[PDB]
Symmetry: C2
Amino acid sequence: IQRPGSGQIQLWQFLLELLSDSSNSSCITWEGTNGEFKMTDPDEVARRWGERKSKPNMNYDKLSRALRYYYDKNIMTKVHGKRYAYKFDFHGIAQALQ
Amino acid sequence: IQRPGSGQIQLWQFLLELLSDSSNSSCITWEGTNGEFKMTDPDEVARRWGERKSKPNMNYDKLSRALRYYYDKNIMTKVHGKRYAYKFDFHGIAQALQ
């Protein structure tokens, strides 16, 4: 776990940070089913990630590629049939906290 | 979030810590459905919590009462139809990380 709001934060924790504050819902919001979320403005999520990390040329293409990497790590999966929807895996997140 | 293994740890984080290590499965284990777990030896979980917190007279009666408190906080719910089964709520856990 890194310090909330920090530049060293990992992507999984950054998305949980944005989700924890309902005022972010115009760009990213919980869906209601445990751990499932949707990027209501995926370009805005990518912009905010770019700004946190000060990474030039960050965009949704790059953000989605990073999210795909979490599947193998058991930290997240995509949700099919929905737009820009993903689901956190509690089993990998618990490990990521230690 | 507190330091893993610390005496100051909260109950929700202590249970995630035990769950993160599959070798604990004789007393507490993931069920497979996202966030659901079962206390395969609830008295052993209570003993380990008692030992972490150095709380005399800790027992399953007291542990279960603490778990009930998390329902109102949106951190956990009981699972009906199953023995000693509970489910973490990602929505309250995300907040608990900030």
